[PDB]
Amino acid sequence: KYDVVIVGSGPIGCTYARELVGAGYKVAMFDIGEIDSGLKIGAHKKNTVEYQKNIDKFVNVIQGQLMSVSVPVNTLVVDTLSPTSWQASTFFVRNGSNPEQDPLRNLSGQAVTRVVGGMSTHWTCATPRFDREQRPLLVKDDADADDAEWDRLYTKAESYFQTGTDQFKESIRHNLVLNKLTEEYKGQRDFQQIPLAATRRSPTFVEWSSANTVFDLQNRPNTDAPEERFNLFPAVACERVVRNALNSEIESLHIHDLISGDRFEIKADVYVLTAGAVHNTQLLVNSGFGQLGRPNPANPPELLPSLGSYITEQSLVFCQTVMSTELIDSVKSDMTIRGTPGELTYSVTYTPGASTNKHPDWWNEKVKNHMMQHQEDPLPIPFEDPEPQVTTLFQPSHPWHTQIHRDANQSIDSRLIVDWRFFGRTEPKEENKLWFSDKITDAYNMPQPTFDFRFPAGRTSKEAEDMMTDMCVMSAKIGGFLPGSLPQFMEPGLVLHLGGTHRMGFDEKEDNCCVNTDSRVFGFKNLFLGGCGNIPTAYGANPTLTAMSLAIKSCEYIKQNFTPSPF
């Protein structure tokens, strides 16, 4: 028996733990995954010396822990088998495929991560705020009060994540890109560093934030926290929350211990579901909320009818570019260069502090030393130059988020290469659904998730195409596309920004929603949901900071309404 139970140890679950453990509550947390980021439980897997020396290899870490949500039955013809080899006569259900899934109405790129710390063990750490246009209301009819509340919540969330906008300031590549783009837009658009949940440790090492940063996930009481009470139980599949008959309270959490194999129930005062946008919905439907099986509107569910509807996933367009000759030449614009590299007579000089220099001394010293010490290398950019991390944030006139950067997720020198990702907002629509099969089960014997999704016609589709054209226009100012990384739409859901599955609003019926602004499930005194599933709006920016802000507000309600047990 606990004061609070939390399902999921990602960053949102850790937000609840951070708030509630600190406030004196007896907290248990369960995760279906296991501890696997070293001794700092739930930490970013990219924070090893080896990955930061070999960042090209981290893509495999990511790929290794993204398990696809819904894979349709495969209908590829292989007709070059030997005649002796067994072959079926039909495209039968095999290799994990979901026979409920229409392959043409899927989010084929959607995937989940079952490890302690969740997706925060691999994420890119971009943590922008949403502007009003993207942001759910927390106060109705008072924009100033709504702004105040959001500013306070985001500020706290930025603290928890260690968000900053300074960590890349001494990158020549970063500055080359930012300054060019700012020139070219002539005041029409603002460029800044991507706000990043991270702390630079040295010129070549960044400590990327994660769930661990928000809450260290060590059992308590401990030497550092002798009055706090926290237990983490990894490898525990949480299966059902038990409703009373009134549907006003949850009475227990049913769990499956994956190691021992045994099933147990856990009693708490407060139940918090932070299992991700897909898996929160799964656990709710497996507990009698919404509707199990293929949507049947002749028989609308009577508990939480908007659960699994109005789902939103962002369009994502991507390319890479190769830095223009003009830009590369500009790096050395202050230099006086004589002779031929590699010969006796060659020299590269600049005047320190000259007001007519385009660049500061630190830049020109780095460029001079590279050019003089590495005369075999034809570029002016130092080898260990940090990567670019640039954004122009969503605005009404360009309603997409942008990242102009190097993401982990070879003929051309990497110093020339810049990634472009533009993220569209998707209108919530009732027909876009995440539902669960009443007969097919997944690898943990839970109802199999199935999507029924298409990008809404109208504004969403128009904007997604305008967004593609915007990426093509803007990237051109920096360089031409890198062959093999040409402008493209990414597989639906590969972006992993799914929202709206258990969406927030003021009124269950009027706002077609599942939780109120305290993240409390309508009707239930002691059930709360956290995560991107809560977000009910069309948004283009990366959602986790916003989800964390909502979680902070939800914890405030819990602190106002439930008393910790005596220690």
Ligand X SMILES: *Cc1cc2c(cc1C)nc1c(=O)[nH]c(=O)nc-1n2C[C@H](O)[C@H](O)[C@H](O)COP(=O)(O)OP(=O)(O)OC[C@H]1O[C@@H](n2cnc3c(N)ncnc32)[C@H](O)[C@@H]1O
From 47, 432, 526, 542, active-site residue? 542
Note whether 543 binds ligand X by CB under 6 A.
yes
| Angle between helix 172-184 and 361-373 (nearest 10) | 120
Nearer to ligand X, 115 or 418 (CB): 115
> How many Cα atoms occupy the beta-carbon half-sphere of 411 within 13 Å?
3
Catalytic residue among 175, 497, 526, 534: 497
Distance of CA 62 to the CA centre of its chain: 12
Q: How many C-beta atoms lie closer than 10 Å to residue 25's C-beta?
A: 26
Contact flag: residue 237 with ligand X (CB under 6 A): yes
- 126 marked as part of a ligand binding site: yes
The binder of 221, among ligand SHG, a second copy, ligand X, none, by C-beta within 5 to 8 A per type, is none
Q: Minimum distance between the CB of residue 417 and a second copy, rounded to whole angstroms?
A: 10
Is 142 annotated as a binding-site member? no
Residue (87 or 345) nearer to a second copy, CB? 87
Is position 505 annotated in a ligand binding site?
no
Sign of CA dihedral 137, 389, 406, 549: negative
Distance CA 333, CA 182 (A): 19
Question: DSSP of 35-51, one letter per residue?
Answer: --SSSSTT--TT-SHHH
Residues 507, 514: Cα–Cα separation, whole Å: 9
Q: Which residues between 97 and 156 bind ligand SHG (CB under 6 A)?
A: 124, 126
Q: Which is nearer to a second copy, 189 or 454 (CB)?
A: 454
Q: Give, as ranges, the residues between 51 and 80 that touch ligand X (CB under 6 A).
A: 62, 66
Q: Which positions ≥6 away from 439 have C-beta within 8 Å? A: 293
Footprint on residues 278-297 left by ligand X (CB under 6 A): 279, 283
Neighbours of 264 (CB within 10 A): 13
Give the C-alpha separation, 81 to 89, whole Å. Answer: 13
When asked if residue 537 is in the footprint of ligand X (CB under 6 A), the reply is: no
Contacts with 448 (C-beta within 8 Å, 6 or more apart), sequence order: 70, 98, 100, 436, 437, 440, 441, 442
For residues 16 and 350, which CB has a smaller minimum distance to ligand X in the complex? 16
402 binds ligand SHG (CB under 6 A): no
Q: Is 220 in the site for ligand X (CB under 6 A)?
A: no
C-beta closer to a second copy: residue 426 or 554: 426
Q: How far is it, in rounded angstroms, from Cα 204 to Cα 465?
A: 38
Could you give the string, one character per residue 375-414, with x where binding to ligand X holds by CB under 6 A and - elsewhere? ----------------------------------x-----
Position 114 contacts ligand X (CB under 6 A): yes
Any catalytic annotation for residue 542?
yes
Q: How far apart are CA 450 and CA 456, in angstroms?
A: 18
Among 45, 180, 279, 421, binds ligand SHG (CB under 6 A): 421
Between CA 247 and CA 254 the distance in angstroms is 17
The entry of a second copy, ligand X, ligand SHG, none near residue 421 (CB within 5 to 8 angstroms by kind) is ligand SHG
Q: Which of 562, 567, 530, 563 is nearest to 547 (CA)?
A: 530
Tell which positions 527-566 bind ligand SHG, by CB under 6 A: 542
The 8-class DSSP code of residue 455 comes to: P
Minimum Å gap between C-beta 469 and a second copy is 5
Which CB sits closer to a second copy, 247 or 485? 485
For residue 413, CA distances in Å to 44, 321, 418, 424 come to: 27, 12, 11, 30
Q: Is 270 annotated as a binding residue?
A: no
* Partner from ligand SHG, ligand X, a second copy, none contacting 136, C-beta within 5 to 8 A by type: none
Stretch that binds ligand X, among 17-25, 110-118, 304-312, 418-426 (CB under 6 A): 110-118
Given 37, 98, 101, 124, the residue binding ligand X (CB under 6 A): 124
13 binds ligand X (CB under 6 A): yes
CA 272, 138, 250 angle in degrees (round to 5)? 25
Which residues partner with 28 through β-bridges? 5, 231
> 544 among the known binding-site residues?
yes
315 binds ligand SHG (CB under 6 A): no
* Residue 494 makes contact with ligand X by CB under 6 A: no
Tokens representing residue 230 in the block? 């926290």
Residue 126 in contact with residue 86, Cβ under 8 Å? no
What number of chain residues touch ligand SHG (CB under 6 A)? 11
C-alpha–C-alpha distance, residues 102 and 418, integer Å: 36
| Annotated catalytic residue 231 | no
Give the one residue of 126, 153, 478, 535 binding ligand X; rule: CB under 6 A.
126
**DSSP H or E run through 447:** strand 447-452
- Contact footprint for ligand SHG (CB under 6 A): 124, 126, 403, 407, 409, 421, 494-497, 542
Binding region: 12, 31, 115, 118-119, 122, 124-126, 238, 544
Q: Please give the residue ranges that form the binding site for ligand X (CB under 6 A).
A: 7-13, 30-33, 62, 66, 113-115, 118-120, 122-127, 237-238, 274-276, 279, 283, 409, 496, 531-532, 542-544
Active site positions, annotated: 497, 542
